[PDB]
Amino acid sequence: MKINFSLLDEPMEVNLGTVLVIEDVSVFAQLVKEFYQYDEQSNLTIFDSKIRSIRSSELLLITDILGYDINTSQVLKLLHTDIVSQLNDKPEVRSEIDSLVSLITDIIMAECIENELDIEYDEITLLELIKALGVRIETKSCTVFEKIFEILQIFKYLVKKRILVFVNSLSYFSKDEIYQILEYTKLSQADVLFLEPRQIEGIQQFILDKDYILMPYNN
Amino acid sequence: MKINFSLLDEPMEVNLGTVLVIEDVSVFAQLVKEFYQYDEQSNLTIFDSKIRSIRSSELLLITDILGYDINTSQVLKLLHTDIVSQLNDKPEVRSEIDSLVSLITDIIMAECIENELDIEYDEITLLELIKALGVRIETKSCTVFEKIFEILQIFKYLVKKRILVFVNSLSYFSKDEIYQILEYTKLSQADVLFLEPRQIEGIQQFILDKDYILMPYN
Amino acid sequence: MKINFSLLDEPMEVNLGTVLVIEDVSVFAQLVKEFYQYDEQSNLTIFDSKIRSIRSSELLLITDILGYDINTSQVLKLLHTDIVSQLNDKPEVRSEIDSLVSLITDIIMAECIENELDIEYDEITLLELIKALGVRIETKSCTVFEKIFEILQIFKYLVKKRILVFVNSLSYFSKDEIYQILEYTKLSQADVLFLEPRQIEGIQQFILDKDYILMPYNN
Amino acid sequence: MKINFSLLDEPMEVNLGTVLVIEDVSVFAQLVKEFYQYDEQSNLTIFDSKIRSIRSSELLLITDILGYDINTSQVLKLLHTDIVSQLNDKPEVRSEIDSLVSLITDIIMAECIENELDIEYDEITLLELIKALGVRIETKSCTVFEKIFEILQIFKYLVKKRILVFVNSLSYFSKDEIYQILEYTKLSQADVLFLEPRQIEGIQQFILDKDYILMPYN
Amino acid sequence: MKINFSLLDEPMEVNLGTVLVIEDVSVFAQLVKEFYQYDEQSNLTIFDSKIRSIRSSELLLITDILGYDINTSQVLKLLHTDIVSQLNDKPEVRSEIDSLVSLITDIIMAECIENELDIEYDEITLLELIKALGVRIETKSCTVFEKIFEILQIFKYLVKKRILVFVNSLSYFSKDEIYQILEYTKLSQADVLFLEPRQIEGIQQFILDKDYILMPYN
Ligand SMILES: [Ca+2]
Ligand SMILES: [Ca+2]
Ligand SMILES: [Ca+2]
Ligand SMILES: [Ca+2]
């Protein structure tokens, strides 16, 4: 996952988490505007190992952390499927749940037989039980750090998003929280690209000087 | 119940099953138009035993028997509410259902706590369990004779509908099936009125001549 | 457009309007049940000149005339497009409508310029004017004859329906009204198949005796 | 207007443009959390000149400038209602619009009568004409400097919002652009409050030290 | 603010103090009738700077200066609510008031327990303390010149009233008192409109001739 712009000499590769610091406010604002307008503008080009350019639908742009909606139909559906798989991995728990559902179905079936009208039903499944329970992620009481962590956790659930990008999101988190975000990103394998006007101390990042020189920085 | 139109001299009473034949095509088509437009048109009237006019919401008009869906939002709502009332009439059974739902919620809650992502849940309700089970009336109908029987069952189940009316629905059923439908209507006590362009032989019916005079038959 | 059942020796062709009378109540009710269940049952087979069997989605079945909804999104959309074409066929009327729309757009544009906020717009078209007018067919005060006539008029608007079929719809209409329906069906070129238990006098129809013998009948 | 939190000794007043710098990352992130949760949390308070608490509906919180859509049900509804009121203030212009709409309705009605299919219509209204024209605020923004200006225009247009708050939005704009934004805020009289993790040189701002003491700068 | 009637060619604006003289007795009496009947009659209209019609509830019409009571149920309600809001703006003072009220309630409760008859009480509230104290505007007026000043003070205090109108109230005040009333109106910024049958010498006023033409004076 390499990204390239006219200011860079060679296309820079983005693997796991990547912190890109732009010291020039003009090039930073122009780069962010090229991030929002990416489908319209040909200046900023992001391509994969196949050199194929990714569509704006495949690109995930995030600026406001608390304003973004983490709960979607596809995210909640795939999450319910993941919970159903977790319950399916254990035979004993699945057997017990099947027993309880069998009892409830017996009770409701008796209540249906007591009625005068002829009634028919099918089954009460686990996905229908999770949908009836209303399982969803809670962003209401979550701190910004837990919100970004939940976004990194649900990025694997999003199928269509090729790369996640954050705009000036590193100013809220402490250095230790940034270390936890990067260390978790290395395990999640997702491609995250952070854009900050000022450099963060203690973390590896790519610095773009006002001279338009891109250099790697350990601190 | 009685129905009154400006063509009849006096309002005729409809009790249990009733077969009404209209020998005039213009009066029959205009009568069906008055049935669908009953809310708009004041010509056709219906007076019950209380001698009170009834709204079109209380009149059930069914022309196509096979095209009438037995499962509807209001029917499923009243059925689910009825089952919820039956389950609410027994405290012990509902208590056991609350215990089982509590166990399932504890298991799914433990599995949610085992996940690395934060999860928020509300609760599970008996109505959500009935809707999740998909409780509905039987949709299996082999012939129109059985479908009309299901329409009579759902009609007798609905308290709001005071009358059920069929338009030219007797042409599909055989004379013996018409006898079984009349006997089932007399056993169910529901009020059913049929409208046919031509007379049917072998059964009692009210024949409306082209002269507009109404005469009983059999 | 030929239809075939086990009772018939050869498939009967349906061209323009066709009146099919079944004197047996058992075969008539079984044929209607095979009309509603057509996708499930293989007994009744309707095929075109290509011998390809038409899907139930391509088949249009109609029993209740006044209960059917003639107003649909596709029917109203294609009807608005037809009205737009009728207005486009006349250059003078289109020019006058363009003039009036130009005047209204001038007034609204002046009102927008009077406001403090910067406002932008595009155009007011003819399709948007028809959609704002709410043009639709009125079945409320229509008689059953006018309802069936409007159904024969909107059958050309329906793209997916291959053939229209009516179940016992000829009992309401007088002989003259049936002659008008057939004479209009010959001009509309649509394929309509009527199913009646009793034969109609004065019109050409295919009669099926209780002996299960199919014969053409002039009266 | 003034804002008050447990960290401050006394509530600080926000008049015209205001720049607030928080030198503590925990107090800044917790402050933004208190901004999004303001409805839920009672810690952060806002007291106007009337010394009355304001609901979260009256507070406009905008973090992403480019990601904030200008067009919305309340913005287009209030705008279309405003244009309808402006057209209603002049009887003659509205009368001419009614005449032209009557002519167009007569033409389309004649074309409908020319068709062989029955057609039913209701009427055409000025609101349907504005919605049909697609009246909306200009969506063209070349840079974030212009987009923030449009946000200030729509904010000054909205009477319900008593305050506009930007979180870390000053990092995109140059110092000169910040001066132009402050001058435009002083000319527009609107109340704008900015929250920055680090201090900005050359402009007047309130610096909150890690010791929690607040001191003015420039 | 502007007022418009069928007699005027164009609506005249009323800003700060305004003196309107009507040289026709029929147009003056019919104008006052249109003032009292303004809710019933649509002839007389009033358009503010927003060009929006105002209800009669927003128009304050005062003819008799001495006969107008300054203390009213709505005025005392808004005043008591205003004092309650001022006391609610300070938590410490309201806390001390709650402490003193708790002490008095403890003393009176002890005296009630000392009695042989059972006694039930609820509580004491700040609103009941203000109403018990009888807080009201000053009712002392030596002359109509001071009473009109109190009417201007209460009018400037009331936000709902957008205009104050006096009918033939300038005949009581001397020319110097009229100058002081105009200067006080310009200092208070309130909109006041006077209606006089005859012109007043020495002050600027709008003269409406019997020909219906309106001309400025001084
Ligand atoms: Ca639930
Ligand atoms: Ca199910
Ligand atoms: Ca309309
Ligand atoms: Ca448009």
Swiss-Prot record, chains B, D, E:
GO molecular function term, any single one: metal ion binding
Gene3D superfamilies noted in UniProt: 3.40.50.11940
BP GO annotations: defense response to virus
Swiss-Prot/TrEMBL keywords: Antiviral defense, Calcium, DNA-binding, Metal-binding
Cofactors (names): Ca(2+)
UniProt-annotated binding residues for Ca(2+): E138, E150
The organism's place on the tree of life at top rank: Bacteria
Gene disruption phenotype: Plasmid transformation is still inhibited.
InterPro entries per UniProt: CRISPR-assoc_prot_Csn2-typ, Csn2_sf
Protein family per UniProt: Belongs to the CRISPR-associated Csn2 protein family.
Function statement: CRISPR (clustered regularly interspaced short palindromic repeat) is an adaptive immune system that provides protection against mobile genetic elements (viruses, transposable elements and conjugative plasmids). CRISPR clusters contain spacers, sequences complementary to antecedent mobile elements, and target invading nucleic acids. CRISPR clusters are transcribed and processed into CRISPR RNA (crRNA). Binds dsDNA. When the CRISPR3/cas system consisting of cas9-cas1-cas2-csn2-CRISPR3 or just cas9-CRISPR3 is expressed in E.coli it prevents plasmids homologous to spacers 1 or 2 from transforming.
Subunit and interaction comment: Homotetramer.
Record-given protein name: CRISPR-associated protein Csn2
Organism: Streptococcus thermophilus
